[PDB]
């Protein structure tokens, strides 16, 4: 359910950018009238795909990843401990000699 929303959003963005790519391919082919404004708007759009590739952003991203990894570790440990408790409870009745 979490990944379906991301898949749909990426699909719609990909469809829009595919339409833009088809239009610019047609314009460069010469089968459609040449628009000097839409082409320059496309150039402005296409000169900014690497959005915010600074080192500070990379450090922040790694910090966030490490924090979420710690939050996953503390949260898998408790589940393992709960399974531990259930197993020991079962062993202390069905195997313990009263």
């Amino acid at each position: 359910e979490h990944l379906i929303a991301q898949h749909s959003a990426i699909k719609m963005l990909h469809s829009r950018v595919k339409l833009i790519l088809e239009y610019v391919k047609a314009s460069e082919a010469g089968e459609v009238p040449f628009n000097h404004e839409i082409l320059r708007e496309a150039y402005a759009l296409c000169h900014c795909l690497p959005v915010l590739s600074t080192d500070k952003f990379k450090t922040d991203f790694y910090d966030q990843c490490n924090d979420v990894g710690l939050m996953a570790y503390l949260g898998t440990i408790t589940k393992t401990c709960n399974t531990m408790n259930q197993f020991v409870n079962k062993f202390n009745v069905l195997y313990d000699r009263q």
Partner: protein, 294 residues
């Protein structure tokens, strides 16, 4: 929409009504044994939407109505909500004469069409007066619960909901007569002077497979708010509070051990799953956007 199932899904059996099971559970009457029996109220999307729309349409006045459904195990299912022709002031509602005729006629007409559910509760809107049971709602809910046992009081606030952007629905049930049993005082304050007389319930919502399928194509411009979602940033306080309550639950379970560990593990798993989902979305965004033209 492909590479999955399209027939009756696993979220449609909640909409199915079994007459024999309901008759058996009504004859069993497991509520009278343990009085802290009901703790969960599952409301359909349609019922919640109708309740909110009717509460807001009343303006500054108060409105009231009924809600149908059933009860299974430890949960109360509320499926549909139909309004009432009440004329109430800014504070109190009466439902004097035409409300009861409307109740009977509407229930009969719904049963004519195919509505197989019975009345499960009543709701009344506080126009900007919070979400709590007043001294009159407590009395009328006790009156209803004494004889028509499966019941629940739903309180909705239209003005606060429209001003803050979040629905405020509260499900409550009243204790019988003589049933006594830096931290904020809101736990006692936000309820009336009868705070010890009634107890709240956990409210959850559900929808059908066709409901979700049709609501998926409801609007095609929230994709921008999904790509630039900025998760793990708008709910950091929520995660910190969840961690605090999880630590308290862990302490309580440790004290007990020296079945409570199950709910603590569930809460920890929920919080960790939310955090991991946020990180997954961030990784997807980074792969999509910043990994191009390098």
């Amino acid at each position: 929409l492909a590479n999955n199932m399209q027939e009756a899904q696993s979220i449609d059996e909640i909409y199915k009504y079994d007459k024999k099971q309901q008759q058996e559970i009504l004859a069993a009457k497991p509520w009278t044994k343990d009085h802290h029996y009901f703790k969960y109220c599952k409301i359909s999307a349609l019922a919640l939407l109708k309740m909110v729309m009717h509460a807001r349409s009343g303006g500054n006045l108060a409105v009231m109505g009924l809600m149908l459904g059933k009860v299974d195990g430890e949960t109360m299912i509320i499926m549909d909500s139909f309004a009432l022709p009440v004329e109430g002031t800014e504070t109190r509602v009466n439902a004097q004469a035409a409300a009861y005729e409307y109740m009977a006629a509407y229930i009969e007409n719904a049963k004519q069409v195919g509505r197989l559910e019975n009345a499960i509760g009543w709701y009344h809107s506080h126009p900007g007066y919070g979400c709590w049971l007043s001294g009159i709602n407590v009395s009328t809910q006790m009156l209803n619960q004494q004889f028509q046992e499966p019941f629940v009081a739903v309180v909705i606030d239209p003005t606060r909901t429209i001003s803050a952007g979040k629905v405020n629905l509260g499900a409550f049930r009243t204790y019988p007569k003589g049933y006594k049993p830096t931290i904020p005082l809101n736990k006692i304050e936000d309820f009336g002077v009868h705070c010890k007389q009634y107890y709240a319930l956990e409210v959850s919502y559900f929808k059908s497979s066709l409901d979700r399928k049709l609501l998926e194509l409801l609007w095609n411009k929230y994709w921008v708010n999904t790509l630039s979602s900025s998760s793990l940033l708008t709910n950091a306080d929520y995660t910190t509070g969840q961690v605090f309550d999880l630590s308290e639950k862990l302490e309580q379970s440790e004290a007990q051990l020296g079945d409570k560990l199950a709910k603590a593990t569930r809460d920890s798993c929920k919080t960790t799953i939310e955090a991991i989902h946020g990180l997954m979305s961030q990784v997807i965004k980074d792969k999509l956007f910043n990994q191009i033209n390098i």
